[PDB]
Amino acid sequence: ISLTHQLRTGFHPGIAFTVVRQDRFATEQLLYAERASESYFVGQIQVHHHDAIGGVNFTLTQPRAHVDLGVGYTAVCATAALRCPLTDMGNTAQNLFFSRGGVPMLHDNVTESLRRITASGGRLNPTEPLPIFGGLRPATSAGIARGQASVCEFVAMPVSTDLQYFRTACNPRGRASGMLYMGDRDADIEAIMFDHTQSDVAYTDRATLNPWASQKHSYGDRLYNGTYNLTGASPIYSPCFKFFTPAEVNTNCNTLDRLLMEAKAVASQSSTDTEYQFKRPPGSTEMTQDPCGL
Amino acid sequence: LTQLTLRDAMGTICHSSLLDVEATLVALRQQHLDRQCYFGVYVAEGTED
Amino acid sequence: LNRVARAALLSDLKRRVCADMFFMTRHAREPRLISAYLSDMVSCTQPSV
Amino acid sequence: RFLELGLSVACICTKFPELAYVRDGVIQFEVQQPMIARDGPHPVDQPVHNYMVKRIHKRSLSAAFAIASEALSLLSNTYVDGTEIDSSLRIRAIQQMARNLRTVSDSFERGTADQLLGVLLEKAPPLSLLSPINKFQPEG
Amino acid sequence: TQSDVAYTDRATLNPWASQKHSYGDRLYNGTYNLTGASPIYSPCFKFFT
Amino acid sequence: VMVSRITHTNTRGRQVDGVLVTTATLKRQLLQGILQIDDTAADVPVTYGEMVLQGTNLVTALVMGKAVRNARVPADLVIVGDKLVFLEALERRVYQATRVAYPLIGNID
Amino acid sequence: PAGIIPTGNVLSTIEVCAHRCIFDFFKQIRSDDNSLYSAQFDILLGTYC
Amino acid sequence: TFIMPMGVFQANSMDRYTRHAGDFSTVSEQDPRQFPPQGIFFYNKDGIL
C-alpha cells in the first residue's frame, strides 16, 4: 500500500512504468507471375438430397482437387506503402483478477481498499462483493471512437552502459540472437536456449540485457508461462505467447526449404474484434499475419 | 502531440504471483548447490557467559 | 464492418476533412499531379444505365 | 468474360471433371543433376538426382439464393386446369428466372478466382528476401 | 453509469461540470429557454444536445 | 523447361507468362510521368477442352484401380526490363453492393 | 465385387455360408448394398522433363 | 586492418583548445573534458559504436 504510494501522488517512486503500441495495420496485395503450370479444370454438378422449414434445394455440385508437384515452387513481389493512412492511440493498464485458483483468508477489507482503493487513471473501474468460479459475462461499457484499450504489455530493461544498444540496434527480452534452427544439431536449447558457455549472440561488449532475468522459471515473466492454469482461467495471449515458449523440432527441419517451411498459424494472438482484448470463446478461425514470430 | 506524466500503476502490482514459493524453485529441485556455504546463517540464545 | 473497421475508416473521414483540398489555391509553387486532387475521382466512384 | 481478358493462361489443360472416382494423386517430377567437379583438389561430388513424396489441401462448398413455395404451389397443373386468364402470371413467369440462373448459376463463375489466391494468396509470404535468392547461394 | 465518452482516460482537463442542466444545459439547449426575449441569431441553440 | 506449339506475345510471333491481384489508385501511378502505352494487336485464341475414351484402357480403369496418364482484344501490354508487361487489372468485372467478408488487407501486429 | 466378365461357371449350389472357415474373405449381402458402388481410383498426371 | 589509438592524451597545451566558449562544457563545477580519455568508440560491422 506505500509502493504504489510512490505510485500515486508526488514522489515519482522507487519504481516506474511504460508503454508499447497496439493498433490495426490492414494489408492489401500485388505480385509478379510467369507461364502455364497452375492447371485449371472445368466440369459439372453432383448430389445428395433433403427437405426443410418451407424449403428444398440446389446447394449440390461440381467438386475439385489439385496438385503439388514442386521441386521448388513459384512467386516473388516488391511493394507499395499502406493506402491513405490508418493509425490511432492512447493510455493506461492490464488485467490480473478476473479468474481464479487461489487460497484463503486472514486479512481482506482493506485491500478491499485496493480495487474499492486500486483500479486507477482511465475509463471504468470495478466491483465490490466477490462470488466465485465462472466465465463471467457482465455489465455495460462503450462503443467505438478511438482506442480499444490500445494498451501496453510491460517488459523492462534494467540498466546501464555508454552510447550504442537503446542509441543503435535493439528489442525486448534479449539479444540479437538465434537459437540455431538447423545446423550443428537440435537437442541443445538448455546452453544455446538455457545454461551457459561463451560471449554474446549479439552485443558482446557486456553479458545480457537487464541485471535480473535471463533463464528458466522466473518472475516478471512469472507474469507469463502456461501449462498449469493461465491458459486455463483468464485467457490470454499474454503479453507474449511466443516471446519465452515452446517452438519447434519434430517434422521437417532442414535449413533451406523450410526456410520456406516455418513462421505460421497456430491458435493465436490479436485480431479485429472490438473493445479491450479477450481470449477464447468459440467462433472465429480467421488467419491474420504476424510478421514478428521467432 | 500528447502527455503521459504522473498517474497509474495501481490497479496493478499489489499483485499475487510474486511472493512465489512453491513451484518455480520446485521445477529446479535436485542438484547440489554451487560453491557456497554459510558465510554465517545459523542463530542462538545467550551464551551462559 | 461491425465494431473494429466502422469506427476508424470514417476516422478516415475527418483527415481528408483536415489537410488537403485547397490543393491549387495557395502558393505559386507546387503543381502538376493530376494524381489524387485532378486524376483519382471521375472513374472510381460510379454511374447508371 | 474469361477468353479475351485476362484472368488465365498460367495453368495446364489436363483432365477430370467429374473428379474423384479419382481417389488419388501424389504427382511429381525429378531433376537430374549432372557431374560437377571443380578445378582444383576438392572433394567428392556426384551425378545426383531428386525425386519426390507428398501432402496437399482443400476447403468445403456451395453458392447462394433461397425463397418460398412456388414449386408445387402451382406445379399442380401441367396441361388441363387453368384455361383462361393467367396472362400476366406467365408473362411475369418468363423474364424473372433468366437473370438469377444466367446470374444465379454463374456464382462459381463467381467462385474460380478466390480459391486459387487463398492457397496462391495462402501458400506464399514476403519479399526483400527473395532478392538475394539470387545474390547468396549457388555452390556452398 | 461508469466513465465517459469522448477522449479516453480523463473526465476532465479543467474541472468543473458534466451531466444535465444548471448553467449547464440552456446556455446552449432546448427544453426551458432563457436566451431571452425576442429574435435570436447569434446562434447556438442547436449547439448543445 | 518450355514446350508447346506456339504463339503468346505482343504482335509478330512467340511465348509467355502468369497471374495477378490488388485494387485501384496504383494504375493510376505509373500514368502521370515515367512509363507508358506499349503494344497493339492480338490474334489470341477462344476456348477450353474436351475428351474421348471407352474400351480397354480404362479396362485398366473400371475393375482394378489406380490411375496413370484467336479472338482479338486489348487486354494489353506494358513493359518491365526489355520485355513487355501488361496493366489493366481487376477492378472492372465482379460483385457490387451487399453484406459479408473475407481475407485480404486488414490489420496486423 | 469385380465387374470383370466371369471366367467360368461354378457347378455347385450349396450353402457356402456353412463353410466360412475356408477362403480368405467372406461377405454376404442379402439383396443388394451400396458397397457395390464405389469407383475410387488413383491418379497420375504425366511426364515432366 | 583497422587501427585506433585509445589512451592518447594531447600533451601540448595549445592543442587542448575548444572551438567556442564552451565547445564541450557542463553544468558541474569541474568540466571533465580535461580528464584524460580512457576508451575508444567505433562503429561496428553494423553501424554500432
- Long-range Cβ contact pairs of A216-224 (< 8 A, separation 24 or more): A216/B27, A216/B28, A217/B24, A217/B27, A217/B28, A218/B24, A219/B17, A219/B18, A219/B20, A220/A154, A220/A155, A220/A156, A221/A173, A222/B17, A222/B18, A222/B20, A222/B24, A223/B17
Q: Measured between alpha carbons, how far is A252 from A250 in angstroms, rounded to an integer?
A: 7
| E-assigned strand segments in D1-140 | 31-32, 49-50
Cell numbers at residue C17, please? Answer: 476533412
What phi and psi values does residue C12 have, to the nearest 5 degrees? -75, 20
How many cross-chain Cβ pairs, A to G, lie less than 8 Å apart?
Answer: 3
Q: Which of A26, A84, A144 sits opposite C7 (nearest CB)?
A: A144
Q: Measured between alpha carbons, how far is A239 from A269 in angstroms, rounded to an integer?
A: 10
For residue F24, which of A36, C17, A30, D28 has the smallest C-alpha distance?
A: A30
Q: Measured between alpha carbons, how far is A273 from A279 in angstroms, rounded to an integer?
A: 11
Resolution in A: 3.1
CB contact under 8 A, H48 and A164: yes
Say whether H32 sits in a helix, a strand or coil: coil
Q: Measured between alpha carbons, how far is G32 from G40 in angstroms, rounded to an integer?
A: 19
What phi and psi values does residue D94 have, to the nearest 5 degrees? -85, -60
A48: DSSP letter: -
Q: Measured between alpha carbons, how far is A294 from C45 in angstroms, rounded to an integer?
A: 43
CA angle A152, A153, A159 (to 5 degrees): 105
Q: Measured between alpha carbons, how far is D25 from G44 in angstroms, rounded to an integer?
A: 6
Cell numbers at residue A237, please? Answer: 495471449
Specify whether the CB–CB gap between F40 and F11 falls below 8 A: yes
The one-letter amino acid code at G4 reads: I
Q: Measured between alpha carbons, how far is D56 from D52 in angstroms, rounded to an integer?
A: 13
CB contact under 8 A, H46 and A168: yes
Specify whether the CB–CB gap between F76 and F86 falls below 8 A: yes
For residue B4, which of A168, E18, A152 has the smallest C-alpha distance?
A: A152
Q: Measured between alpha carbons, how far is H16 from H10 in angstroms, rounded to an integer?
A: 7
Specify whether the CB–CB gap between A6 and A14 falls below 8 A: yes
Q: Which of F24, F32, F106 sits opposite C35 (nearest CB)?
A: F32
CA D86 to chain centre: 45
What phi and psi values does residue H15 have, to the nearest 5 degrees? -80, -15
The one-letter amino acid code at E48 reads: F
CA angle A269, A273, A276 (to 5 degrees): 80
Please tell me chain E's helix, strand, coil percentages from 3-state DSSP, rounded to the nearest 5: 5, 0, 95
Specify whether the CB–CB gap between E22 and E29 falls below 8 A: no
A76: left (phi over 0), alpha (psi -120 to 50) or beta: beta
A205: DSSP letter: T
- Bridge partners of G34, per DSSP, are none
CB contact under 8 A, F16 and A287: no
What residue in F sits closest to G3 (Cα-Cα)? Answer: F63
CB contact under 8 A, D22 and G42: yes
Please tell me chain F's helix, strand, coil percentages from 3-state DSSP, rounded to the nearest 5: 5, 5, 90
Specify whether the CB–CB gap between A237 and A212 falls below 8 A: no
Whether chain D lies against chain H with 3 or more Cβ pairs closer than 8 A is no
**Close Cβ partners of D34 (under 8 Å, ≥ 6 residues apart):** D47
CA torsion A265-A267-A268-A273 (nearest 10°) is: 110
For residue A144, which of A286, A268, A272 has the smallest C-alpha distance?
A: A272
Handedness of CA D104, D109, D110, D111 (dihedral sign): positive
What residue in A sits closest to G49 (Cα-Cα)? Answer: A71
Q: Measured between alpha carbons, how far is A144 from A137 in angstroms, rounded to an integer?
A: 20
Segment (H or E) for A6: helix A5-8
Q: Measured between alpha carbons, how far is A105 from A127 in angstroms, rounded to an integer?
A: 19
Please tell me chain G's helix, strand, coil percentages from 3-state DSSP, rounded to the nearest 5: 5, 0, 90
Q: Measured between alpha carbons, how far is E16 from E14 in angstroms, rounded to an integer?
A: 7
Q: What residues in A contact D64, CB-CB < 8 Å?
A: 59
C partners (3+ CB pairs within 8 A) are: A, F
Cell numbers at residue E36, please? Answer: 431571452
- Long-range Cβ contact pairs of E35-43 (< 8 A, separation 24 or more): none
Cell numbers at residue C35, please? Answer: 494524381
What residue in G sits closest to A37 (Cα-Cα)? Answer: G48
CB contact under 8 A, A92 and B8: yes
Q: Does A283 touch chain C (CB under 8 A)?
A: no
Cell numbers at residue A289, please? Answer: 499475419
Cell numbers at residue C30, please? Answer: 507546387
Cell numbers at residue D123, please? Answer: 501458400
Closest Cα in chain C, distance from residue F108 (Å): 13
Q: Measured between alpha carbons, how far is A173 from A209 in angstroms, rounded to an integer?
A: 7
D partners (3+ CB pairs within 8 A) are: A, F, G
Burial of B11 (0-12, 13-18, 19+ CB in 10 A): buried
CA angle A237, A239, A240 (to 5 degrees): 75
Cell numbers at residue A115, please? Answer: 480495487
Say whether A34 sits in a helix, a strand or coil: strand
For residue A234, which of A284, A280, A282, A283 has the smallest C-alpha distance?
A: A280
Say whether F85 sits in a helix, a strand or coil: strand
Neighbours of A169 (CB within 10 A): 15
